[PDB]
């Protein structure tokens, strides 16, 4: 109940919300059915429209008008945005040449440059080029300020998950808004776009920018606008707020546009009907900038133009139906569309089986347009698992397609020609970022970056301390003229041991054998230098990784590779080696096929054993440094040390062997040498964070050898490929992957074929950032380079996408 019989006189677009049943006059009251009786009359004036004409200049102030052209309007803060242009011979902002804004030029009383966040729904990255002729204001912001060629949304590339990621710097799994539609089993409650449940504060985790500002005594404009409030009225309201006295004035403001998303759904991303919505958005930008210029704020305010996600061509006829695969379709609930999430229809049904549903959905039709996953098996780059609201069974849908339960769902809900939600690496889903103002750089391009990074920068722009989030603070410093945040490298927590020869061969009873009893002092000092680290500067190019948690580990040197060997996990945390362009690939000699050798620097008690692999009928083993890339027949024996061995399912050894035998050399030849760091990952609770010992759900049978959930590699070389990886004088180039360690290759529908037809495609799907691996391992890479730390932070957030132009 709201007693809607109070008044909005003098309260129009008030900043503090009032508590029911008192009637509201804020920009959200409509959405709550709670506005005072006179809200439209007083607060939503429309008389005479939004522009001054010649004949209104100097007019007598008529309060009924939407905006004013009277003499007193500038000091009242309520002129039409084109007032000075029409009535005072001023130019439109877009017609002025751009001049660098070296320092903020603010009216007295301003303590900091305000921030205006202009968000556009469904604004695909390529609109910046393809619509440039009809968006002159946006094009001026873009070319005069700082821009990226695109910004990466989070998965799923839906509206609410991305708007709230923008607000919090959090992944949807952490902020809780994991779709436009959700079921929370603990609350037993459902969230949807339409309706009241979504207003309950319990859905919304983390700490969004407006709360962060408020707690730190920076005042915030109310960020959300009722859908019926016209864009012109939003702009005028913001401009009026910017004329409040110093003590009442917000420092941060938000504008949100439903376009071009609304039209893109109807007409597709490049439908000819799309030109008009783009023109209209640009006109709104022009109104804001002309209004700021009137207030002399156009060289004071930092403006961010940002999208939530792109738009892809999708039609009703491109729908896969679960009823074409599953026998018991009525025993499931699907969240449908551009992603799929499946749960049991009834919790009282003990006949329900996820394993059979997955099997019924796996590679069933020659060009099936979705792939099922248990959520813990999704690519780790999506960070889409650690939330009770994310159903165990997930469908990744091909771009341009929909999934539905039954055909009746499509025609008893073609309307739409566009949709979004797909994998966030998909080109059509990428969106836009422009920063313009005193604090942003002038005429500067920056590389694509992820939207999780923006919260930190919005905090920097306002002098705020960000709440803990998933951005990497400092990685977007290169966007900014000043207000940079100067991060320090984390402190190493565990120091390594450097073991020498300490054990005799006969102390080991590991059940391993090697044909290596084949015997010279010229070369005997040599093997010794190599074991003491003589070639370490060749193979460890960026310093050893730092271990950021408490543990016991050994640095082990070899001719061809260096490793950090964990006495707790019984295997390396990391193995580092450099492969030059000239390197040659050799095979494993026949006699050495099953060779595993005791490492006399490491005690039997802290070693794996071959017996466990023999007894374990499911598990085999592989090596982190590959024997194929040994520098000499003698160096090869090092690759067979028990300390270089890791557990691997036979199915996974197909992937791993092909990566090591074929792909490393291919990368080295293409990138002019590569430095490789590989290792195991344990993430049994799928939280994207390093497991402790007590979280490991699986061991090699009859032993304490933990089974990794994933294996990673980080492949670095010189950005200037005319320089070899091991002699690079400047910026680096990286690509990385986190491959799931699976007992089958069900994920790859072509896996019965030669590895050359499917393995590289798998690896590409599982591309990762160095930062993702840091989280999953507790390691810190690139500790000793010649590069600035902010630049290294940028490198660590880079994702190699494998999408064309
Ligand atoms: C991306 O960035 C984010 C943000 O930094 C990272 O997430 C953080 O990671 C931390 C480690 O996982 C986690 O810390 C835990 O916090 C517990 C208290 O949490 C509450 O308070 C905070 C602070 O305001 C709040 O943010 C939390 O919000 C969550 O929960 C509410 C609802 O409950 C949601 O609305 C909200 O969306 C958010 O949910 C998300 O996080 C939770 C986990 O907290 C998930 O379960 C959800 O799915 C969702 O992802 C909370 O309201 C604290 O109690 C924990 O402490 C335990 O463990 C420590 C080890 O240090 C131990 O000392 C303690 O004893 C304790 O154990 C006891 O409790 C156990 C659980 O019941 C029990 O099993 C034991 O036996 C013990 O009794 C812990 O410190 C932090 O909360 C989140 N923050 C956020 C915002 O998610 C994230 O990791 C980053 N991702 C990547 C890939 O890097
Ligand atoms: C509730 N959330 C968080 C939040 C909310 C807003 C906000 O007012 N609305 C009103 C809009 C109504 N609405 C759709 O009707 C809609 C639109 C497109 C769709 N495609 N498919 N279904 C769709 C449904 C979407 C809603 C977002 C705006 C904001 O901005 C957050 C800012 C944070 C800082 O960076 C820029 C954005 N956050
Ligand atoms: Ca949207
Ligand atoms: Ca974990
Ligand atoms: Cl959804
Ligand atoms: Na075995
Ligand atoms: Na297969
Ligand atoms: Zn949409």
Short mmCIF file of C-alpha atoms in Angstrom, two decimals, residues 171-545:
data_model
loop_
_atom_site.label_atom_id
_atom_site.label_comp_id
_atom_site.label_asym_id
_atom_site.label_seq_id
_atom_site.Cartn_x
_atom_site.Cartn_y
_atom_site.Cartn_z
CA UNK A 171 31.66 -12.25 -12.28
CA UNK A 172 27.95 -13.18 -12.34
CA UNK A 173 28.72 -16.33 -10.25
CA UNK A 174 29.94 -14.02 -7.47
CA UNK A 175 27.42 -11.17 -7.68
CA UNK A 176 24.53 -13.63 -7.98
CA UNK A 177 22.84 -12.35 -11.11
CA UNK A 178 23.68 -15.39 -13.27
CA UNK A 179 20.95 -14.79 -15.84
CA UNK A 180 17.97 -12.68 -16.87
CA UNK A 181 15.95 -15.57 -15.41
CA UNK A 182 16.86 -17.51 -12.17
CA UNK A 183 15.64 -20.07 -9.63
CA UNK A 184 17.23 -19.97 -6.16
CA UNK A 185 16.70 -23.33 -4.42
CA UNK A 186 17.63 -22.00 -0.93
CA UNK A 187 15.13 -19.11 -1.15
CA UNK A 188 12.87 -21.38 -3.20
CA UNK A 189 12.17 -18.27 -5.26
CA UNK A 190 12.32 -17.24 -8.91
CA UNK A 191 13.80 -14.03 -10.42
CA UNK A 192 12.49 -12.69 -13.79
CA UNK A 193 12.68 -9.53 -15.95
CA UNK A 194 8.95 -8.89 -15.59
CA UNK A 195 7.63 -8.75 -12.03
CA UNK A 196 8.29 -7.84 -8.43
CA UNK A 197 10.68 -10.57 -7.10
CA UNK A 198 13.72 -8.97 -8.83
CA UNK A 199 13.28 -5.91 -6.54
CA UNK A 200 14.13 -7.94 -3.46
CA UNK A 201 17.68 -7.04 -2.28
CA UNK A 202 18.57 -10.74 -1.64
CA UNK A 203 19.33 -11.47 -5.30
CA UNK A 204 21.96 -8.77 -5.56
CA UNK A 205 25.37 -9.56 -4.13
CA UNK A 206 28.67 -7.68 -4.04
CA UNK A 207 28.87 -3.95 -3.62
CA UNK A 208 27.83 -1.81 -6.59
CA UNK A 209 29.38 1.57 -7.42
CA UNK A 210 26.56 3.71 -5.99
CA UNK A 211 26.86 1.92 -2.56
CA UNK A 212 30.70 2.17 -2.66
CA UNK A 213 30.43 5.94 -3.37
CA UNK A 214 27.79 6.48 -0.67
CA UNK A 215 29.80 4.64 2.07
CA UNK A 216 32.81 6.76 1.26
CA UNK A 217 30.90 10.04 1.30
CA UNK A 218 30.68 10.57 -2.44
CA UNK A 219 27.07 11.36 -3.42
CA UNK A 220 25.46 9.43 -6.23
CA UNK A 221 22.67 10.30 -8.68
CA UNK A 222 20.00 7.59 -8.61
CA UNK A 223 21.19 5.18 -11.36
CA UNK A 224 17.91 3.62 -12.58
CA UNK A 225 15.24 5.19 -14.75
CA UNK A 226 11.57 4.10 -15.11
CA UNK A 227 11.07 2.92 -18.73
CA UNK A 228 8.35 5.52 -19.49
CA UNK A 229 10.53 8.51 -18.50
CA UNK A 230 11.70 9.79 -21.90
CA UNK A 231 15.40 10.06 -22.68
CA UNK A 232 15.14 13.85 -23.01
CA UNK A 233 13.78 14.08 -19.44
CA UNK A 234 16.59 11.86 -18.06
CA UNK A 235 19.19 14.21 -19.59
CA UNK A 236 17.43 17.33 -18.25
CA UNK A 237 17.17 15.74 -14.80
CA UNK A 238 20.94 14.97 -14.76
CA UNK A 239 21.69 18.51 -15.91
CA UNK A 240 19.43 19.93 -13.17
CA UNK A 241 21.18 17.75 -10.55
CA UNK A 242 24.49 19.18 -11.72
CA UNK A 243 23.19 22.68 -10.80
CA UNK A 244 22.46 21.67 -7.19
CA UNK A 245 24.57 23.48 -4.57
CA UNK A 246 27.90 21.87 -3.70
CA UNK A 247 26.74 20.11 -0.53
CA UNK A 248 23.71 18.47 -2.27
CA UNK A 249 25.21 17.70 -5.72
CA UNK A 250 26.10 14.13 -6.72
CA UNK A 251 29.55 13.36 -8.08
CA UNK A 252 28.45 10.30 -10.05
CA UNK A 253 25.55 9.96 -12.49
CA UNK A 254 24.09 7.22 -14.70
CA UNK A 255 22.09 7.34 -17.93
CA UNK A 256 20.72 4.07 -19.43
CA UNK A 257 19.34 3.59 -22.96
CA UNK A 258 17.17 0.55 -23.92
CA UNK A 259 18.29 1.16 -27.54
CA UNK A 260 19.72 -0.17 -29.77
CA UNK A 261 18.95 -3.54 -28.01
CA UNK A 262 15.18 -3.06 -28.31
CA UNK A 263 15.25 -2.60 -32.10
CA UNK A 264 18.10 -5.16 -32.63
CA UNK A 265 15.83 -7.88 -31.20
CA UNK A 266 13.15 -7.02 -33.77
CA UNK A 267 15.23 -6.26 -36.84
CA UNK A 268 18.58 -7.95 -36.27
CA UNK A 269 21.90 -6.26 -35.58
CA UNK A 270 22.21 -4.64 -39.07
CA UNK A 271 18.55 -4.47 -40.17
CA UNK A 272 17.92 -1.25 -42.14
CA UNK A 273 15.56 -0.20 -39.30
CA UNK A 274 18.67 0.06 -37.07
CA UNK A 275 19.91 3.37 -38.49
CA UNK A 276 17.24 5.44 -36.75
CA UNK A 277 17.84 4.14 -33.18
CA UNK A 278 21.56 4.85 -33.69
CA UNK A 279 20.80 8.41 -34.85
CA UNK A 280 18.53 8.86 -31.86
CA UNK A 281 21.14 7.67 -29.35
CA UNK A 282 23.65 10.03 -30.92
CA UNK A 283 21.18 12.91 -30.62
CA UNK A 284 20.80 12.17 -26.87
CA UNK A 285 24.60 12.25 -26.50
CA UNK A 286 24.59 15.64 -28.31
CA UNK A 287 21.94 16.90 -25.87
CA UNK A 288 24.04 15.88 -22.87
CA UNK A 289 27.22 17.46 -24.25
CA UNK A 290 25.46 20.71 -25.28
CA UNK A 291 23.91 20.81 -21.80
CA UNK A 292 27.31 20.27 -20.16
CA UNK A 293 28.83 22.99 -22.36
CA UNK A 294 26.06 25.50 -21.22
CA UNK A 295 26.93 24.72 -17.64
CA UNK A 296 30.65 25.13 -18.49
CA UNK A 297 31.14 21.45 -17.49
CA UNK A 298 32.25 20.02 -20.87
CA UNK A 299 35.96 20.19 -19.91
CA UNK A 300 35.27 19.14 -16.31
CA UNK A 301 33.19 15.91 -16.47
CA UNK A 302 34.55 12.41 -17.23
CA UNK A 303 32.09 10.67 -19.56
CA UNK A 304 32.03 6.91 -20.08
CA UNK A 305 30.12 5.55 -23.09
CA UNK A 306 29.73 1.84 -22.52
CA UNK A 307 27.60 -1.12 -23.76
CA UNK A 308 26.43 -4.24 -21.94
CA UNK A 309 26.78 -6.77 -24.88
CA UNK A 310 26.32 -6.96 -28.66
CA UNK A 311 23.61 -8.55 -30.84
CA UNK A 312 23.62 -11.52 -33.22
CA UNK A 313 21.21 -12.59 -36.08
CA UNK A 314 18.92 -15.22 -34.60
CA UNK A 315 15.50 -16.43 -35.90
CA UNK A 316 12.78 -18.93 -34.75
CA UNK A 317 13.65 -21.44 -37.44
CA UNK A 318 17.14 -21.76 -35.91
CA UNK A 319 15.91 -23.55 -32.79
CA UNK A 320 17.05 -26.99 -31.56
CA UNK A 321 14.40 -28.89 -29.57
CA UNK A 322 15.26 -31.05 -26.60
CA UNK A 323 12.20 -33.16 -27.50
CA UNK A 324 14.24 -34.31 -30.54
CA UNK A 325 16.81 -35.90 -28.16
CA UNK A 326 15.26 -36.78 -24.79
CA UNK A 327 12.59 -39.40 -24.08
CA UNK A 328 11.36 -37.88 -20.78
CA UNK A 329 11.29 -34.15 -21.72
CA UNK A 330 8.40 -33.57 -19.22
CA UNK A 331 10.61 -34.43 -16.26
CA UNK A 332 12.88 -31.42 -16.91
CA UNK A 333 12.79 -27.63 -16.58
CA UNK A 334 14.83 -25.75 -19.14
CA UNK A 335 15.86 -22.12 -18.97
CA UNK A 336 15.88 -21.65 -22.77
CA UNK A 337 17.22 -19.48 -25.61
CA UNK A 338 20.83 -18.52 -26.36
CA UNK A 339 22.06 -20.65 -23.46
CA UNK A 340 20.42 -23.64 -21.80
CA UNK A 341 20.18 -24.57 -18.13
CA UNK A 342 18.52 -27.84 -17.09
CA UNK A 343 17.22 -29.08 -13.78
CA UNK A 344 14.73 -31.73 -12.61
CA UNK A 345 11.10 -30.57 -12.85
CA UNK A 346 10.28 -32.21 -9.49
CA UNK A 347 12.64 -32.73 -6.49
CA UNK A 348 10.43 -35.69 -5.45
CA UNK A 349 11.49 -37.57 -8.64
CA UNK A 350 14.33 -40.03 -7.83
CA UNK A 351 14.17 -41.44 -11.37
CA UNK A 352 15.86 -38.22 -12.60
CA UNK A 353 19.42 -38.78 -13.83
CA UNK A 354 21.82 -36.06 -15.06
CA UNK A 355 24.23 -38.62 -16.52
CA UNK A 356 21.66 -39.97 -18.95
CA UNK A 357 20.46 -36.48 -19.89
CA UNK A 358 24.02 -35.45 -20.77
CA UNK A 359 24.55 -38.70 -22.69
CA UNK A 360 21.27 -38.23 -24.63
CA UNK A 361 22.46 -34.70 -25.57
CA UNK A 362 26.06 -35.54 -26.55
CA UNK A 363 27.00 -35.50 -30.24
CA UNK A 364 23.66 -36.95 -31.34
CA UNK A 365 23.23 -35.18 -34.71
CA UNK A 366 25.95 -34.46 -37.34
CA UNK A 367 25.88 -30.63 -36.81
CA UNK A 368 24.10 -30.33 -33.48
CA UNK A 369 24.01 -26.52 -32.58
CA UNK A 370 24.54 -26.76 -28.84
CA UNK A 371 26.89 -28.76 -26.59
CA UNK A 372 25.95 -30.02 -23.14
CA UNK A 373 28.28 -29.62 -20.18
CA UNK A 374 28.20 -30.32 -16.51
CA UNK A 375 28.84 -26.74 -15.22
CA UNK A 376 32.20 -27.72 -13.68
CA UNK A 377 33.37 -28.72 -17.17
CA UNK A 378 32.59 -25.38 -18.86
CA UNK A 379 35.75 -23.47 -20.06
CA UNK A 380 37.25 -21.89 -16.99
CA UNK A 381 37.43 -18.50 -18.81
CA UNK A 382 33.60 -18.27 -18.47
CA UNK A 383 33.83 -18.42 -14.64
CA UNK A 384 30.27 -19.81 -14.71
CA UNK A 385 29.81 -22.43 -12.02
CA UNK A 386 30.26 -21.42 -8.38
CA UNK A 387 26.65 -20.42 -7.62
CA UNK A 388 23.67 -22.51 -6.42
CA UNK A 389 21.61 -20.58 -8.94
CA UNK A 390 23.58 -22.08 -11.88
CA UNK A 391 22.07 -25.47 -12.72
CA UNK A 392 24.48 -28.44 -12.91
CA UNK A 393 23.56 -29.06 -16.54
CA UNK A 394 24.43 -26.33 -19.02
CA UNK A 395 24.05 -26.03 -22.77
CA UNK A 396 26.44 -23.83 -24.72
CA UNK A 397 24.50 -22.76 -27.80
CA UNK A 398 26.11 -22.05 -31.17
CA UNK A 399 26.04 -18.42 -32.30
CA UNK A 400 22.88 -17.67 -34.35
CA UNK A 401 20.89 -20.44 -32.63
CA UNK A 402 18.34 -21.03 -29.87
CA UNK A 403 17.57 -24.06 -27.75
CA UNK A 404 13.98 -24.83 -26.56
CA UNK A 405 12.27 -27.69 -24.67
CA UNK A 406 9.49 -28.47 -27.24
CA UNK A 407 8.32 -26.79 -30.47
CA UNK A 408 5.11 -25.60 -28.76
CA UNK A 409 7.31 -23.28 -26.61
CA UNK A 410 8.29 -21.25 -29.69
CA UNK A 411 4.68 -20.55 -30.85
CA UNK A 412 2.69 -20.57 -27.50
CA UNK A 413 5.30 -18.48 -25.50
CA UNK A 414 8.71 -15.31 -36.25
CA UNK A 415 8.88 -12.24 -33.99
CA UNK A 416 12.58 -11.71 -33.38
CA UNK A 417 15.54 -11.35 -35.70
CA UNK A 418 18.21 -10.69 -33.04
CA UNK A 419 19.34 -12.08 -29.74
CA UNK A 420 22.34 -12.26 -27.38
CA UNK A 421 23.54 -14.49 -24.49
CA UNK A 422 26.18 -16.59 -26.36
CA UNK A 423 29.81 -17.37 -25.27
CA UNK A 424 31.48 -14.00 -24.46
CA UNK A 425 34.36 -14.56 -26.91
CA UNK A 426 31.93 -14.49 -29.87
CA UNK A 427 32.56 -11.38 -32.05
CA UNK A 428 28.90 -10.45 -32.40
CA UNK A 429 28.58 -10.24 -28.58
CA UNK A 430 31.47 -7.75 -28.07
CA UNK A 431 30.49 -4.25 -27.09
CA UNK A 432 31.86 -0.72 -26.76
CA UNK A 433 33.95 1.44 -24.45
CA UNK A 434 34.82 5.16 -24.76
CA UNK A 435 36.24 7.37 -22.03
CA UNK A 436 36.28 11.14 -22.53
CA UNK A 437 37.36 13.83 -20.06
CA UNK A 438 40.22 15.38 -18.01
CA UNK A 439 41.14 12.08 -16.33
CA UNK A 440 41.13 10.01 -19.59
CA UNK A 441 43.88 10.13 -22.16
CA UNK A 442 43.67 12.24 -25.27
CA UNK A 443 43.17 10.58 -28.75
CA UNK A 444 44.34 7.24 -27.47
CA UNK A 445 43.49 3.69 -28.53
CA UNK A 446 43.79 0.93 -25.98
CA UNK A 447 43.61 -2.86 -26.50
CA UNK A 448 40.30 -4.69 -25.93
CA UNK A 449 39.69 -5.46 -22.23
CA UNK A 450 36.96 -7.16 -20.16
CA UNK A 451 34.07 -5.32 -18.56
CA UNK A 452 34.99 -6.75 -15.04
CA UNK A 453 37.91 -4.26 -15.06
CA UNK A 454 35.76 -1.06 -15.26
CA UNK A 455 34.51 -0.88 -11.66
CA UNK A 456 38.10 -0.35 -10.42
CA UNK A 457 38.53 2.52 -12.89
CA UNK A 458 35.22 4.11 -11.98
CA UNK A 459 36.39 3.96 -8.33
CA UNK A 460 39.71 5.57 -9.38
CA UNK A 461 37.85 8.34 -11.27
CA UNK A 462 35.95 9.21 -8.11
CA UNK A 463 38.82 8.75 -5.60
CA UNK A 464 37.11 5.64 -4.09
CA UNK A 465 38.58 2.45 -2.67
CA UNK A 466 36.97 -0.40 -4.62
CA UNK A 467 35.34 -3.24 -2.77
CA UNK A 468 37.07 -6.64 -3.39
CA UNK A 469 36.31 -7.58 -6.96
CA UNK A 470 37.46 -9.65 -10.03
CA UNK A 471 39.20 -6.85 -11.91
CA UNK A 472 42.97 -6.62 -11.61
CA UNK A 473 43.52 -3.19 -10.27
CA UNK A 474 46.19 -1.39 -12.29
CA UNK A 475 45.59 -3.31 -15.54
CA UNK A 476 43.65 -0.35 -17.03
CA UNK A 477 46.11 2.36 -15.85
CA UNK A 478 47.06 3.00 -19.49
CA UNK A 479 43.52 4.41 -20.06
CA UNK A 480 44.18 7.27 -17.63
CA UNK A 481 46.06 10.55 -17.70
CA UNK A 482 46.22 10.68 -13.85
CA UNK A 483 44.55 9.04 -10.78
CA UNK A 484 46.50 5.91 -11.64
CA UNK A 485 46.62 3.34 -8.77
CA UNK A 486 50.09 2.05 -8.32
CA UNK A 487 49.96 -1.62 -7.34
CA UNK A 488 52.80 -3.53 -5.69
CA UNK A 489 53.66 -7.11 -6.54
CA UNK A 490 52.37 -9.59 -3.96
CA UNK A 491 54.95 -10.85 -1.49
CA UNK A 492 56.20 -14.41 -1.98
CA UNK A 493 54.87 -16.46 0.94
CA UNK A 494 56.87 -19.69 0.58
CA UNK A 495 60.56 -19.82 -0.18
CA UNK A 496 61.85 -22.86 -2.13
CA UNK A 497 64.43 -25.43 -1.10
CA UNK A 498 67.36 -26.08 -3.48
CA UNK A 499 68.07 -29.83 -2.92
CA UNK A 500 71.38 -31.37 -4.06
CA UNK A 501 72.08 -35.12 -4.48
CA UNK A 502 70.85 -36.69 -1.19
CA UNK A 503 69.63 -40.24 -1.98
CA UNK A 504 71.05 -43.40 -3.39
CA UNK A 505 69.18 -45.19 -6.16
CA UNK A 506 68.59 -48.28 -3.97
CA UNK A 507 66.70 -46.21 -1.33
CA UNK A 508 63.83 -45.99 -3.79
CA UNK A 509 61.30 -48.74 -4.12
CA UNK A 510 58.87 -47.11 -6.54
CA UNK A 511 58.36 -50.08 -8.85
CA UNK A 512 59.71 -48.07 -11.79
CA UNK A 513 62.31 -49.23 -14.29
CA UNK A 514 64.48 -47.54 -16.89
CA UNK A 515 66.89 -48.90 -19.45
CA UNK A 516 69.57 -46.33 -18.61
CA UNK A 517 72.62 -48.27 -17.30
CA UNK A 518 74.84 -46.86 -20.11
CA UNK A 519 77.95 -44.84 -19.04
CA UNK A 520 83.86 -39.22 -19.23
CA UNK A 521 85.11 -36.12 -17.31
CA UNK A 522 85.04 -33.53 -20.17
CA UNK A 523 81.22 -33.76 -19.91
CA UNK A 524 80.90 -34.63 -16.16
CA UNK A 525 81.48 -31.10 -14.84
CA UNK A 526 78.88 -30.13 -17.49
CA UNK A 527 75.97 -32.29 -16.20
CA UNK A 528 76.79 -30.87 -12.73
CA UNK A 529 76.61 -27.19 -13.90
CA UNK A 530 73.20 -27.97 -15.49
CA UNK A 531 71.85 -29.49 -12.26
CA UNK A 532 73.09 -26.38 -10.37
CA UNK A 533 71.26 -24.04 -12.76
CA UNK A 534 73.78 -23.04 -15.47
CA UNK A 535 71.14 -22.92 -18.24
CA UNK A 536 68.40 -21.45 -15.97
CA UNK A 537 68.46 -18.00 -17.67
CA UNK A 538 67.56 -19.75 -20.94
CA UNK A 539 64.49 -21.61 -19.54
CA UNK A 540 63.26 -19.30 -16.82
CA UNK A 541 62.92 -16.00 -18.70
CA UNK A 542 60.73 -13.91 -16.36
CA UNK A 543 61.98 -15.05 -12.94
CA UNK A 544 60.56 -17.99 -11.04
CA UNK A 545 56.84 -17.74 -10.21
#
